[PDB]
């Protein structure tokens, strides 16, 4: 997201607004306004590693621009010269890492091991497995989507093509096996 | 759901993996080790588009 | 499937040896998945967008 003043009334604010969000929603539920249009009107800017040098990026669309003990401690805004803002910091994860529930709440190598194991997780690769003739294919009898779903999964199609099952787990040592 | 973006050669689905490499047309300086007489060597991988 | 399609490969030799490029440099943020990677000889070299 682009962070310019664009507001003589006061402090900095994101160029994108609720009107643009409503238009994007309307185009979504229609099937005119889409990411091409956002790029043309310069609401969102493509930024590379080299150009990241010269820009100060805000954490959240509202948290930095202007308390429950249980809530995450976040460092207060210190600078008042932001130029971009993260669309969502959850979008730094990859495919296999966007399937982990609550990656924040894990020790990082254990996110790595899951991201490796998701590839070999059983599921439903494609819907034409009967038509195809693959050397090695595994299909779960009853694929089930995660109860602890993630919003990235609606775009990753994990809900439509799950890889795993929801099982009732009891964390205990019953017989030592 | 299949998003394509792969080849099919003799019915085997083949994917080309992005080959990371040093960027072209950039000047990079590196410090060198003491035993070598070279110190602070600059390198450029000049390339035509 | 999607992981392989977005996978990236570094041409540095896979043989076990000390290497700066095997770390997750700060500039990898948001362009390379900081968690997804193979584990073993290829760890850190293979990267996923």
């Amino acid at each position: 997201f682009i962070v310019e003043d664009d507001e003589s009334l006061g402090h900095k604010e994101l160029k994108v607004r609720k009107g643009h969000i409503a238009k994007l929603m309307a185009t979504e539920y229609q099937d005119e306004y889409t990411w091409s249009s956002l790029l043309n009107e310069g609401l969102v800017e493509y930024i590379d590693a080299e150009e990241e040098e010269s820009i100060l990026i805000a954490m959240q669309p509202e948290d930095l621009e202007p308390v429950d003990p249980a809530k995450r401690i976040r460092v207060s805004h210190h600078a008042t010269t932001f130029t971009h803002c993260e669309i969502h910091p959850s979008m730094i994860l990859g495919v296999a890492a966007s399937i982990i529930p609550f990656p924040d709440h894990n020790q990082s190598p254990r996110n790595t091991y899951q991201s490796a194991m998701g590839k070999q997780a059983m599921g439903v690769f494609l819907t034409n497995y009967n038509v195809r003739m693959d050397t090695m294919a595994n299909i779960l009898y009853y694929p089930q989507k995660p109860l602890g779903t993630t919003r990235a999964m609606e775009y990753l199609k994990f809900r439509e093509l799950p890889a795993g099952q929801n099982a009732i787990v009891a964390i205990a040592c019953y017989s030592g096996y | 759901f299949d998003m394509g973006g792969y080849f099919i050669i003799n019915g085997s689905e083949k994917v080309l993996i992005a080959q990371e490499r040093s960027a072209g047309n950039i000047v990079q300086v590196f410090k060198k080790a003491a035993p070598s007489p070279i110190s602070h060597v600059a390198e450029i991988r000049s390339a035509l588009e | 499937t999607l992981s392989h399609l977005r996978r990236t490969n570094t041409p540095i030799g896979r043989d076990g040896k000390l290497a700066k490029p095997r770390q997750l440099h700060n500039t990898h943020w948001g362009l390379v998945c900081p968690a997804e990677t193979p584990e073993g000889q290829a760890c850190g070299l293979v990267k996923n967008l």
Binding site: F1, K18, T27, W35, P61, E62, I87, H88 | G4, G5 | -
Partner: peptide, 30 residues
């Protein structure tokens, strides 16, 4: 109302726009 501030929940709509109009394999296709 049209010029109201955006929220983090609304950023997901922008993300959906990205994913609809490019997709995951977009760089390879392009």
């Amino acid at each position: 109302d049209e010029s109201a501030p955006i929220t983090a929940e609304d950023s997901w709509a922008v993300i959906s726009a990205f994913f609809r109009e490019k997709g995951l394999v977009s760089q390879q296709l392009d």
